[PDB]
Amino acid sequence: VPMDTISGPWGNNGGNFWSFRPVNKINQIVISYGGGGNNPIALTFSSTKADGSKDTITVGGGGPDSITGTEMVNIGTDEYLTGISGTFGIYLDNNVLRSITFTTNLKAHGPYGQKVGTPFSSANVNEIVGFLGRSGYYVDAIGTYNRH
Amino acid sequence: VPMDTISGPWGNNGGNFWSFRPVNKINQIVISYGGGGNNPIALTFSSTKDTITVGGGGPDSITGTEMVNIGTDEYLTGISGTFGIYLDNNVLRSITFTTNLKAHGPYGQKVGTPFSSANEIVGFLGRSGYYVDAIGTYNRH
Ligand SMILES: CO[C@H]1O[C@H](CO[C@H]2O[C@H](CO)[C@@H](O)[C@H](O)[C@@H]2O[C@@H]2O[C@H](CO)[C@@H](O)[C@H](O)[C@H]2NC(C)=O)[C@@H](O[C@@H]2O[C@H](CO)[C@@H](O)[C@H](O)[C@H]2NC(C)=O)[C@H](O[C@H]2O[C@H](CO)[C@@H](O)[C@H](O)[C@@H]2O[C@@H]2O[C@H](CO)[C@@H](O)[C@H](O)[C@H]2NC(C)=O)[C@@H]1O
């Protein structure tokens, strides 16, 4: 049984594995921030079905950390995710996701968070049809599922 | 400059180092529990005022406490207990505080790997975060 090509994951081995590849396009992403600054702590990916129901996952933000702010990625009708990039660095003695950018066929959304630490970038070829990685209190790792 | 004899510590490398050796006798120990059960999450050592609390660094709410009251002619002499897994953490599961008079405990659930010290206990040290990762004693004969 064939399975979608994984790019990455990028990051480290903390937290718990997570995966989300819905059968319908991911049209909305919420970046949750903590600590009063631009510190990403959680990601929500959602895909709205024709009937009004949503496929959704939230990863990271597994702790008591108060959500202090959110940013959103809105993916339009003739828009689709093509690439991701960002940085992994230290947030409160944790090597985690520090910034993230979501590229579509139409624009780059972001940067979301703080451009600090070790950078990573997906291969510029392609459609991103899902995400996977590791998370706990924050986002420990992230990669993509891909289909050309 | 001499320093008091350390026994142990026992446990693992989790959490942060802690240490408490007061010049006044430790007369009370509070054992804090979490998750509605017999699961120790924090230890408070207090002197006749010197005090420390170790563990309980999480949002985990305290669901109960128990107390050792050390008598005026009583003093700590040994410790023992177990370490094991509590919510994906290899931490302290039970502890017994022995004095010249009696063993106090056990406090918690006697599950996991046992330990026991080989005297007066004059303080404690260890590692802690959300729970108690390690524990040992300062000693003076
Ligand atoms: C529920 O408590 C656990 O998770 C705490 C947060 O760490 C999680 O999130 C990060 C980032 O996403 C991730 O990398 C971790 O793996 C962990 O996720 C958990 O992963 C395990 C599998 O590994 C999985 O089973 C769990 O489901 C998953 N949790 C969730 C909610 O999904 C963690 O506290 C963090 O621990 C790391 C070191 O592992 C540390 O760097 C972080 O600074 C610290 N976070 C915070 C907010 O303090 C919990 O562990 C605590 O307490 C334990 C018990 O006493 C200790 O053994 C741990 O070491 C840690 O204490 C911290 O220790 C570091 C030094 O090691 C010290 O700098 C901190 O001060 C101290 N914390 C305190 C309060 O003193 C526990 O794993």
Residue numbers in the entry:
A (entry chain B): 3 to 127, 130 to 152
B (entry chain A): 3 to 50, 56 to 125, 130 to 152
Structure paper excerpt:
The most populated conformation of bisected N-glycan is termed the ‘back-fold’ conformation, in which the α1–6 arm is flipped back towards the stem region of N-glycan (GlcNAcβ1–4GlcNAc). In summary, our study provides the first atomic structures of a flipped-back conformation of bisected N-glycan bound to two specific lectins. Thus both proteins, PHA-E as well as Calsepa, are specifically ‘back-fold conformer selective’, rather than broad bisecting GlcNAc-selective lectins.
Calsepa lectin (16 kDa) belongs to mannose-binding type Jacalin-related lectin, and was found to show relatively higher affinity toward bisected glycans than non-bisected glycans. Two GlcNAc residues, GlcNAc-5 and GlcNAc-7, are aligned in parallel and the putative hydrogen atoms (H2 and H4) of GlcNAc-7 can make van der Waals contact with the hydrogen atoms (H1, H3 and H5) of GlcNAc-5. In addition, one hydrogen bond is observed between NH group of GlcNAc-5 and N-acetyl carbonyl oxygen atom of GlcNAc-7. In summary, Calsepa lectin can be considered ‘back-fold conformer selective’, and will not favor a glycan with an extend conformation.
